[PDB]
Design a protein around this ligand. Structure first.
Ligand SMILES: Nc1ncnc2c1ncn2[C@@H]1O[C@H](COP(=O)(O)OP(=O)(O)O)[C@@H](O)[C@H]1O
Ligand SMILES: Nc1ncnc2c1ncn2[C@@H]1O[C@H](COP(=O)(O)OP(=O)(O)O)[C@@H](O)[C@H]1O
Ligand SMILES: Cc1ncc(COP(=O)(O)O)c(C=O)c1O
Ligand SMILES: Cc1ncc(COP(=O)(O)O)c(C=O)c1O
Ligand SMILES: [Zn+2]
Ligand SMILES: [Zn+2]
Lengths: 312, 312
């Protein structure tokens, strides 16, 4: 894009692979946004791998950094994107940070990816310490303008469990109620209208006109499911979601469409090469499932629409 | 490019700005290389700012990561790019790592940016602890395939001081002697044939034919000096350098030309905006001088040649 948009993305960093800031920075950059990256952690790779070693930051390490920026008077953003953290102290502090910033720039938008767990093999389990659920639930979502939760995470926040599209739609109403005006469930089990081989994603948006009226947007999408478990997809999503909604602040359908389309492309590209390195009748390993970002540069920049959002 | 090239870049990371891995990753990426980033440090910004806070890694923290990669068997590269470190332990280990990799892969190329100091305001001073000079001088350069030293650093390594083009050409010879076969002094004071308002850069390359003959390449370049002190330029250079020489392994002139051209563009773009935010008759601050990476995406991908290298 051509306007001056700065984004303070606070997420995980992996030496190898695309997950965390690693999966979010490129997209936003090739998209035109100026990114300020704070890495909550530095691991060798993502925990999906059998082994993973690395380091983590605590509230003080985050303070040091922001203080640094603070001291130089360069703490001015237009957006804020947050993700992976294992430190409740760290997360809490972000909230304080986000707010001081929203005080300076009332126009700031805070995209929150409530990264806590995975909804795989049925219902799920979190992949971060439990002490964050409360923090995300009570201090973070409140102050978020856009959330990109997991069916799982989304159940985790609203404290319920989805078993129908409706039930889903309610959690989005509820979630909104907690703060965000734009809410997206990146995916879920909901018995898609067609095929078990299809992922469904729901996105709600609520706006208050200067006349008091509240214009509501509700969209459902059926994505073509890939026979694999990728990691970092969520992060790429939000990062791109942050870019399209900026383009179409009142077009959740469109913003989500581009976004999920880019998503499809990237993913199709990945599984292709993945199955190539694994061989026929052999399952791609997490290492072989890393997102083929660089290769998808053009698709990210201008994704052809391959998913048409249905307006509920 | 269209082949599978992985690069293990080990350098500094700044939350805000383009410097260290922040300045090196994007270029290599939009250029086609698959990057693996290890951040030797994470600071708010670059030390050129009045204040800077952040954390640093030590040999153990680097080991962790390497071990992490090791354990998963993904410690396989085609290149290695190294830069900013303040830890001699860190630097040393990097070497051991480099060697273990060169054993596994004899075709690996190690680009080494001997980042230690600045040659500004006449003669300079290092911006890193002294204990690194020895390490760079005795353990790193020996094993490097391509160095991109600072007139200052270059002096620092060969232990001398340049006061003529010759004096320069010698040091490159001396440098080669220590190990690298491709050597580049990104810049120096040498009284350019035209203008004080011109930066001179010298690039030497030495190849050993299968017939025993040693083909030598020597090129000098006159760059148009910008009325400012940027930071991260060096890092950008090496990264791009790493990319063109990969394209033209036997065309130091060409590889250098593209790179430096890109450099010019990027830089021209930067000083322009910079002076805009500072105002007429007011000097751009280090914050206002951050490279305009993103904005230069296209120029990086295909830089028009605006500097013609002279073949000494
Ligand atoms: N297996 C898959 N098949 C098809 N699309 C996927 C698949 N996994 C992720 N996606 C896409 O990437 C995004 C990430 O979804 P999700 O699995 O909920 O991510 P995460 O759990 O990482 O937050 C979704 O918008 C979806 O369209
Ligand atoms: N003031 C400047 N004017 C013109 N070109 C510059 C200027 N500063 C940096 N560059 C370009 O960026 C590259 C980085 O070079 P240099 O500044 O010597 O390295 P470093 O950033 O490591 O000190 C240079 O080789 C040159 O091509
Ligand atoms: C370090 C790290 N970051 C981010 C993620 C996010 O993964 P996803 O976006 O696919 O849910 C994971 C898992 C992870 O281990
Ligand atoms: C954190 C950091 N990284 C890298 C550099 C390298 O700068 P340059 O590319 O201008 O040598 C500096 C100075 C620095 O402070
Ligand atoms: Zn997620
Ligand atoms: Zn340098």
């Amino acid at each position: 894009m051509e306007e001056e948009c700065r984004v303070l993305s606070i997420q995980s960093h992996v030496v190898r692979g695309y997950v965390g800031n690693r999966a979010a920075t490129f997209p936003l950059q090739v998209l035109g946004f100026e990114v300020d990256a704070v890495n909550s952690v530095q691991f060798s790779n993502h925990t999906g791998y059998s082994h993973w070693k690395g380091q983590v930051l605590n509230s003080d390490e985050l303070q040091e950094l922001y203080d640094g920026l603070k001291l130089n008077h360069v703490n001015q953003y237009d957006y804020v994107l947050t993700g992976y953290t294992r430190d409740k102290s760290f997360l809490a502090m972000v909230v304080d940070i986000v707010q001081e910033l929203k005080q300076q720039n009332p126009r700031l938008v805070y995209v929150c990816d409530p990264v806590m767990g995975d909804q795989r093999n049925g219902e799920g389990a979190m992949y971060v310490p439990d002490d964050l659920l409360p923090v995300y639930r009570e201090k973070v979502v409140p102050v978020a303008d856009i959330i990109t939760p997991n069916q799982f995470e989304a159940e985790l926040l609203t404290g319920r469990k989805i078993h129908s599209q409706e039930e889903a739609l309610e959690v989005m109403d509820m979630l909104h109620s907690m703060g965000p005006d734009t809410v997206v469930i990146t995916s879920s089990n909901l018995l898609s209208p067609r095929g078990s081989d299809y992922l469904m994603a729901l996105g709600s948006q609520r706006t208050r006109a200067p006349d008091g009226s509240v214009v509501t947007q509700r969209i459902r999408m059926e994505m073509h499911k890939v026979d694999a478990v990728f990691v970092g997809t969520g992060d790429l999503f939000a990062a791109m979601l942050l870019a399209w909604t900026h383009k179409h602040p009142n077009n959740l359908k469109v913003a989500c469409e581009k976004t999920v389309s880019a998503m499809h492309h990237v993913l199709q590209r990945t599984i292709k090469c993945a199955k190539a390195k694994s061989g026929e009748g052999v399952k791609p390993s997490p290492a072989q499932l890393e997102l083929r970002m660089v290769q998808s540069k053009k698709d990210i920049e201008s994704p052809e629409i391959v998913v048409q959002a249905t307006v509920l």
